[PDB]
């Protein structure tokens, strides 16, 4: 519902001896789900902030569809005034108000009245099924009740865009699931510009459809989840995007060699950085009879982890410290030799 411009977009504190974000420039249209994900919790927080409205940049401009409202230093359209609704980790509910009380806190001079008001909180709680719970303190409600009152409190005004920072971060992994769910459901029925900031990739490859990555406060790829996935700019994002391993050779004719493994790429460069997502390696004690992997070597199982009712599996080559994990149905056990197999196309090189 609004177009958002971030131009040249930078923020400084201590005098300028950090720069929190660094010429950021995104043109997020209107209606777009648009994450940012990167290593520093507080520089997305800072992006987010200055969408909000809560901070502003030290240098560039910010528009929400042509209207400018931050500028070099200068609040110019201040939050309340944006269209925009909060769900923020550290924007907790009142803990002496119920939850109805939480709901119609934003309405409180937008000129309605009593039965306004209430007409609203009633209407925005059925709808997100807590008009049940309306009388309860925050306290008294489960996570889930907690999540739904303040996506309703953020909602409450009827938003343009919608604004995420670690928004499923204080529910218990089980139920984190249905929370993405629900703000998917929210967005598709309202068609709210919608960003979200997370630490976690999950949260991206749920609500997200297209991806900014921040690191040192440089915007360093854009684009859809799945192909800063399968093609990362560096191996900064594709550890940001997904778990991988990072395996660090020497350059060959024959390939990128890594003591008893050799990926069968190349890069101009003497030595070059290996990526390889775990479900991309497979091992086994003897040859497999599947064309659609490829050997690479020996290696030895150095460790073995259990999660999520399957083995974590860490080898490394002969001759070397490299590591490489990878997922499995059944254990090879510790000090074993096997054959490691990687899908081909799945290899991802860097030049070190």
């Known amino acids: ?16 001896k950090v720069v929190a974000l660094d010429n950021v420039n995104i043109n997020i249209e209107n209606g777009e ?6 290593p520093s919790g507080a520089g997305k927080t800072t992006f987010m902030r200055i969408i909000a409205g809560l901070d502003v940049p030290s240098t560039g401009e910010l528009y929400f569809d042509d209207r400018l409202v931050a500028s070099n230093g200068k609040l110019i359209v201040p939050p309340e005034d944006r269209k925009i609704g909060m769900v923020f980790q550290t924007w907790a509910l009142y803990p002496n108000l119920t939850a109805f009380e939480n709901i119609a806190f934003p309405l409180t001079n937008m000129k309605m009245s009593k039965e306004e008001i209430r007409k609203r909180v009633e209407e925005v709680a059925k709808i997100l099924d807590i008009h049940h719970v309306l009388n309860h303190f925050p306290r008294e409600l489960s ?10 409190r953020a909602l409450v005004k ?32 309202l068609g709210v510009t919608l960003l979200v900031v997370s630490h976690d990739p999950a949260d991206i490859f749920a609500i997200a459809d297209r991806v900014g990555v921040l690191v040192k406060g440089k915007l ?53 950085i290996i990526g390889i997502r775990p479900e991309d390696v497979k091992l086994s004690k003897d040859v497999i009879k599947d064309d659609s992997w490829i050997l690479v070597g020996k290696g030895k199982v150095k460790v ?49």
């Open 1 to 16: 519902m609004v177009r958002i411009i971030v131009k040249n977009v930078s923020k400084v504190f201590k005098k300028g």
């Open 33 to 38: 789900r648009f994450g940012i994900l990167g």
């Open 143 to 152: 996570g889930a009740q907690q999540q739904r009152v303040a996506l309703a």
């Open 158 to 189: 009827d938003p343009s865009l919608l604004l995420l920072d670690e928004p499923f971060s204080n529910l218990d992994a089980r139920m984190r699931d249905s929370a993405r769910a629900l703000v998917k459901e929210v967005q598709s029925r």
């Open 220 to 272: 360093v790829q854009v684009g859809k989840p799945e192909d800063l996935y399968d093609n990362p700019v560096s191996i900064q994002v594709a550890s940001l995007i997904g778990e991988i391993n990072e395996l660090e050779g020497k350059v060959t004719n024959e390939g990128v060699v890594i003591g008893s493994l050799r990926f069968p790429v190349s890069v101009s460069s003497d030595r070059a």
């Open 304 to 352: 073995i982890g259990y999660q999520g009712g399957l083995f974590r599996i860490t080898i490394t080559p002969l001759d070397s410290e490299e590591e490489i994990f990878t997922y499995s149905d059944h254990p090879i056990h510790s000090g074993e030799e096997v054959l490691v197999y990687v899908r081909k196309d799945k290899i991802k090189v860097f030049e070190k």
